């Protein structure tokens, strides 16, 4: 089926996501509304339920509000049953309207609808070529106090109505009992509770298996994507076995949220996007777009440097979800902000690399500060705002122009207030010119592009004051004046003759799993897929057409491989790197080592004989391990995704700078479980 099909659950670069807080969008069925203290139909107390549900989203797909805009994916609130308590936090009452306080991950939140309403949403969205992404928040259940069993629902977890346990008198240790995080370290933020939310213990086998069974159920109901909440607050090792469960079962696009503040660049963030199996909400893009287009705290050179730098730092930049605001940020549009600023930032996001996500109500110019003021009910479903027309004209180019869905980003002209960039994929081109200065015209001279000669009409139709571009010989544009606030988009599409790979999903899975390779120029006849130097042909290629190949991963050893495609004529594509073949199914094992004293700056790591442990290479060892919360120095510990049902060999080592000190003695051995978790508790061998 083509890369642009609604059935492509693995890659979303050709999509535009609309992020919906279910409760704040449309109340299509008032009979399922919470009653009493939990409900506010006027939606003026924004911490209560206002009544929005899945029938409301179905109505807005059916009547053309969402499809008229060109939206091809909706991101909705976590669908699972939440606690029913109205919690009074210092006078103000609070409900689970946001979906984040789960009590049963196998049932629906009845305020949103029944299981049949969820199914009708999937089917209605798919029948209108809209993919459905759900939030999933496996880090916690709900607010709880072990000291006060009567507070809220005591964080209790049910499995399809059967109570597994609560936070008070947690004899099975389903939860962590280490106190609340102060966010001082990543370790601290993982094993301690976020605020008062009962922290799930993923090293408990019942919890591990339950959460994995639960995500499979939602995959079985037809969801096309998962946004995982709080990825910075769960063990990386556990989340990698969780991604392995999804990808080895029914791979769908998965991305997490790891917040970054203005000008913050975090190596751990980029390492998570590059090695976890899921991509991220691109905060780096979002914060810089807001500094240049909203707050005027940086100029176009800052924008250029983020675009150029992120192309390198993210191994798969076409998988990052971009946005200009969302549920954790003040709305982009302010009371005294010019509406053109929002209109340009939306144009920039819709034509840039990644997967664009538009927060509900952007097209209606909603203003609002932080939580909960950025979650007001949508005021209007007017389909004629300039913001609605901008998304309506640009969001289709993601399906029609592969340079926008997949291409490289190249700055063609710039100064403090103007950027003209080009997106290029094969011979498909899109060129975007943005003047953020609302008062001054920009004289453009010397612009050169990859456009064939012609008179290109602005895809926006002049609504943001764009103009026609005349391109002469050799891609040289005739000189022009870009209007104050001007934004224009010019494009050219044609066939690719050469194979070009634009995206691959999933990027981590065991031998036997079918992966999806999207791009252009693959041709109609079945050709060859290379995993490193291993060629895959014939029956292992499940489908081949010009924009998409589906192929089974060969039985090669675990490790990182480059993907390359050769069409039937033997012409080969660009290399798509960093694909991880797993040794097999994954389980998370906690490795604990005692008596490992270290010097300043010296940490303990783990390595062993499978790719998941770095195949004995100190530079790819797992760690640095932890030593403060669950166990304390000189005991170190870490949760690691390792192949299931196998005897692995390993050794611990200390690293400080370039110096590696290996444990002495024989290599350690351990036979991993087939499912669930296990703990290895050992003593440093001198």
Residues contacting 369, CB < 8 A, separation 6+: 330, 331
Annotated ligand binding at 195? The verdict is: yes
Helix then strand then coil, in percent of the chain rounded to 5, is 25, 30, 45
Give the interface segment with Ca ion, choosing from 233-241, 398-406, 469-477, 536-544 (CB under 5 A): 233-241
Q: From 49-57, 447-455, 578-586, 665-673, give the range in contact with Ca ion by CB under 5 A.
A: 49-57
412 is in an annotated binding site: no
Tell me if 167 is assigned to a ligand binding site. Answer: no
Is there binding between residue 32 and Ca ion (CB under 5 A)?
yes
Contacts of Ca ion in 51-90 (CB under 5 A): 51, 53
What's the token pair of residue 142?
A: 């709900």
Q: CA-to-CA distance for 674 and 678, rounded, in angstroms?
A: 10
Considering the candidates 257, 282, 319, 580, report the single residue annotated as catalytic.
Answer: 257
Location of structure tokens 């999937």: 122
> Is position 3 annotated in a ligand binding site?
no
- 663 three-state secondary structure: coil
Flag whether 62 is marked binding. no
Beta-sheet pairing, 157-159 with 162-165: antiparallel
282 binds Ca ion (CB under 5 A): no
Q: Is 567 annotated as a binding residue?
A: no
In whole angstroms, how close is the CB of 242 to Ca ion at the nearest point? 13
120 is in an annotated binding site: no
CB of 204 to Ca ion, least distance (A): 12
> Are 509 and 248 contacting, i.e. CB atoms less than 8 angstroms apart?
yes
Q: Please, which residue, 220 or 328, has the CB nearer to Ca ion?
A: 328
Report the residue number, 57 or 460, with the smaller CB distance to Ca ion: 57
- Minimum CB separation of residue 240 from Ca ion in Å reads 15
Residue number, 288 or 590, with CB nearest to Ca ion: 590
Residue of the chain from 9, 60, 233, 290 that contacts Ca ion (CB under 5 A): 233
Q: Is 305:311 a contact under the CB 8 Å cutoff?
A: no
CA distance 102 to 106: 10
DSSP 3-state of 23: helix
| 270 annotated as belonging to a binding site for a ligand | no
| Token pair listed for 290 | 């807001």
Q: Looking at 96-104, 226-234, 402-410, 481-489, which segment touches Ca ion (CB under 5 A)?
A: 226-234
177 is in an annotated binding site: no
Instruction: Find the shortest distance in angstroms from Cβ 414 to Ca ion.
Output: 43
Nearer to Ca ion, 238 or 359 (CB): 238
- Could you say whether residue 114 binds Ca ion (CB under 5 A)? no
Q: Give the binding range for Ca ion (CB under 5 A) out of 167-175, 198-206, 507-515, 558-566.
A: 198-206
- Output the smallest distance, CB 174 to Ca ion, in A: 13
CB of 322 to Ca ion, least distance (A): 27
53: annotated binding-site residue? yes
Contact (Cβ atoms closer than 8 angstroms) between residue 565 and residue 522: yes
Of 27-35, 61-69, 101-109, 582-590, the segment contacting Ca ion by CB under 5 A is 27-35
Of the two residues 139 and 204, which places its CB atom closer to Ca ion in the complex? 139
User: Please, which residue, 153 or 199, has the CB nearer to Ca ion?
Assistant: 199
User: How far apart are the C-alpha atoms of 456 and 442, rounded to whole Å?
Assistant: 19
| Residue 347, CA atoms < 13 Å, CB-side half-sphere | 37
Sign of dihedral through CA atoms 505, 506, 508, 512? negative
199 makes contact with Ca ion (CB under 5 A) = yes
Residue with tokens 């978790």: 677
Binding residue per annotation — 373? no
**Which residues, 426 to 465, sit near Ca ion by CB under 5 A?**
none
Nearer to Ca ion, 27 or 518 (CB): 27
- Min. distance of Cβ 48 from Ca ion in angstroms? 13
Using CB under 5 A as the binding rule, whether residue 232 contacts Ca ion is answered as no
Q: Which of 104, 229, 343, 518 is catalytic?
A: 229
* 519 annotated as belonging to a binding site for a ligand: no
CB of 233 to Ca ion, least distance (A): 4
* 556-558-563 Cα angle (round to 5): 65
**Structural contact between residues 225 and 9, judged by C-beta atoms closer than 8 angstroms:** yes
Among 33, 392, 470, 498, binds Ca ion (CB under 5 A): 33
When the beta carbons of 33 and 574 are compared against Ca ion, the nearer one is 33
From residue 15, alpha-carbon distances to 6, 353, 480 in Å are 9, 11, 32
Residue 229 interacts with Ca ion (CB under 5 A): yes or no: no
Cβ burial 355-378 (10 Å sphere, 16+ → b, else e): bbbbbbbbbebbbbeeebebbbbb
- In 394-472 the beta strands, taken as DSSP E runs, fall at 408-414, 418-425, 428-435, 442-444, 454-456, 469-471
Q: Is 422 a catalytic residue?
A: no
Integer Cα distance of 245 and 232 in angstroms: 19
The two beta strands, 355-359 and 321-322, are parallel
Told to check if 423 binds Ca ion by CB under 5 A, we report: no
Cα angle for residues 307, 428, 490 (degrees, 5° grid): 75
**Tokens coding 315:** 């191994």
Q: Is 518 an interacting residue with respect to Ca ion (CB under 5 A)?
A: no
402 touches 442 (CB < 8 A): no
Cβ atoms 257, 231 nearer than 8 A:
yes
> Is there a binding annotation on residue 193?
yes
Q: How far is the CB of 456 from Ca ion (least distance, A)?
A: 47
- Strands 17-19, 73-76: pairing is parallel
CB atoms within 10 A of CB 512: 12
Q: Is 380 exposed, middle or buried (0-12, 13-18, 19+ CB in 10 A)?
A: exposed
Task: Give the closest residue to 278 by CA, choosing from 263, 257, 298, 296.
Answer: 257
Minimum separation from the CB atom of position 140 to Ca ion (A)? 7
The interface with Ca ion within residues 129-168 (CB under 5 A) comprises 139
Question: How far is the C-alpha of 257 from the C-alpha of 234, rounded, in Å?
Answer: 12
Residue 135 counted as an annotated binding residue: no
C-beta closer to Ca ion: residue 51 or 354: 51
CA 354/CA 285 separation, integer angstroms: 10
Q: For Ca ion, give the closer residue by CB, 139 or 344.
A: 139
417 carries an active-site annotation = no
Integer Cα distance of 192 and 549 in angstroms: 44
Alpha-helix residue ranges (DSSP H) falling in 236-337 = 236-247, 267-275, 283-293, 300-313
- Interface size with Ca ion, residues (CB under 5 A): 9
Identify the CA nearest to 564 among candidates 552, 553, 577.
Answer: 577
| 15, 27, 224, 518: which one binds Ca ion (CB under 5 A) | 27
Q: CB atoms < 10 A from the CB of 261, how many? A: 8
Nearer to Ca ion (CB atom), residue 166 or residue 402? 166
Interaction residues for Ca ion, span 641-670 (CB under 5 A): none
520 binds Ca ion (CB under 5 A): no
199 is in an annotated binding site: yes
In whole angstroms, the minimum distance from the beta carbon of 386 to Ca ion comes to 31
Question: Would you please indicate which residues are annotated as catalytic (active-site) residues?
Answer: 229, 257
Judged by the rule CB under 5 A, the positions of this chain that interact with Ca ion are 27, 29, 32-33, 51, 53, 139, 199, 233
Annotated binding site for Ca(2+): 27, 29, 32-33, 51, 53, 139, 190, 199, 233
Annotated binding site for substrate: 100-101, 140, 193-196, 227, 232-233, 327, 371, 375
Annotated binding site: 27, 29, 32-33, 51, 53, 100-101, 139-140, 190, 193-196, 199, 227, 232-233, 327, 371, 375
């Amino acid at each position: 089926a083509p890369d642009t099909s609604v059935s492509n659950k693995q890659n979303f670069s050709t999509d535009v996501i609309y992020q919906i807080f279910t409760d704040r969008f449309s109340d299509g069925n008032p009979a399922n509304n919470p009653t009493g203290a939990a409900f506010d139909g006027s939606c003026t107390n924004l911490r209560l339920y206002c009544g929005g549900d899945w029938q409301g989203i179905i109505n807005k797909i059916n009547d053309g509000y969402l499809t008229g805009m060109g939206i091809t994916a909706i991101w909705i609130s976590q669908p699972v049953e939440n606690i029913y308590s109205v919690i009074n936090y210092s006078g103000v009452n609070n409900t689970a309207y946001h979906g984040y306080w789960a009590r049963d991950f196998k049932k629906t939140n009845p305020a949103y609808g029944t299981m049949q309403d969820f199914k009708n949403l999937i089917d209605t969205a798919h029948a209108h070529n809209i993919k459905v992404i759900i939030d999933f928040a496996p880090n916690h259940t709900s607010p709880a106090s072990s000291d006060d069993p009567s507070f809220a629902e005591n964080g209790r977890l049910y499995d399809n109505g059967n109570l597994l346990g609560g936070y008070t008198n947690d004899t099975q240790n389903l939860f962590h009992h280490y106190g609340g995080t102060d966010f001082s370290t990543i370790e601290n933020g993982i094993y301690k509770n976020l605020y008062d939310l009962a922290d799930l213990n993923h090293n408990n086998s019942s919890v591990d298996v339950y959460l994995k069974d639960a995500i499979k159920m939602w995959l079985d109901l037809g969801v096309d994507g998962i946004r995982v909440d709080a990825v910075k607050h769960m063990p990386f090792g556990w989340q990698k076995s969780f991604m392995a469960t999804i990808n080895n079962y029914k791979p769908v696009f998965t991305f997490g949220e790891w917040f970054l503040g203005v000008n913050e660049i975090s190596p751990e963030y980029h390492q998570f996007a590059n090695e976890s199996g899921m991509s991220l909400l691109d905060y780096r893009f979002a914060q810089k777009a807001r500094q240049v287009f909203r707050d005027n705290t940086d100029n176009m050179y800052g924008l250029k440097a983020m675009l150029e730098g992120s192309e390198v730092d993210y191994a798969q930049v076409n998988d990052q979800v971009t946005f200009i605001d969302n549920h954790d940020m003040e709305r982009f549009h302010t009371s005294n902000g010019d509406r053109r600023k929002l209109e340009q930032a939306l144009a920039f996001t819709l034509t840039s690399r990644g997967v664009p996500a538009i927060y509900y109500g952007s097209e209606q110019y909603m203003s609002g500060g932080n939580d909960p003021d950025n979650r007001a009910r949508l005021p209007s479903f007017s389909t004629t705002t300039t913001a609605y027309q901008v998304i309506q004209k640009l969001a289709p180019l993601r399906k029609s122009n592969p340079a926008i869905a997949y291409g490289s980003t190249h700055e063609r002209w710039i100064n403090n207030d103007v950027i003209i960039y080009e997106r290029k994929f094969g011979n498909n081109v899109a060129v975007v010119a943005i003047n953020r200065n609302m008062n001054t015209p920009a004289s453009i001279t010397g612009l050169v592009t990859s456009l064939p000669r012609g008179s290109y009409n602005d895809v926006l139709g002049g609504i943001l004051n764009g103009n026609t571009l005349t391109v002469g010989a050799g891609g040289a544009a005739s000189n022009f004046t870009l209007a104050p606030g001007g934004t224009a988009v010019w494009q050219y599409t044609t066939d690719a003759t050469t194979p070009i790979i634009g995206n691959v999903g999933p990027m981590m899975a065991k031998p036997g799993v079918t992966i999806t390779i999207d791009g252009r120029g693959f041709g109609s006849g079945k050709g060859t897929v290379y995993f490193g130097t291993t060629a895959v042909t014939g029956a292992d290629i499940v489908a081949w057409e010009d924009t998409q190949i589906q192929v089974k991963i060969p039985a090669v050893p675990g490790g990182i491989y480059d993907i390359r495609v050769a069409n039937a004529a033997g012409a080969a594509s660009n290399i798509y790197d960093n694909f991880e073949v797993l040794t097999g199914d994954q389980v998370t094992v906690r490795f604990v080592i005692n008596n490992a004293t270290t010097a300043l700056g010296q940490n303990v790591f783990l390595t062993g004989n499978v790719s998941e442990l770095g195949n004995w290479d100190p530079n790819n060892a797992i760690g640095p391990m932890y030593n403060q919360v669950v166990y304390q120095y000189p005991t170190w510990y870490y949760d690691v995704s390792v192949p299931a049902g196998q005897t692995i060999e390993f050794k611990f080592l200390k690293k400080q700078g370039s110096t590696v000190t290996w444990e002495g003695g024989a290599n350690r051995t351990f036979t991993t479980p087939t499912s669930g978790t296990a703990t290895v508790n050992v003593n440093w061998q001198p």
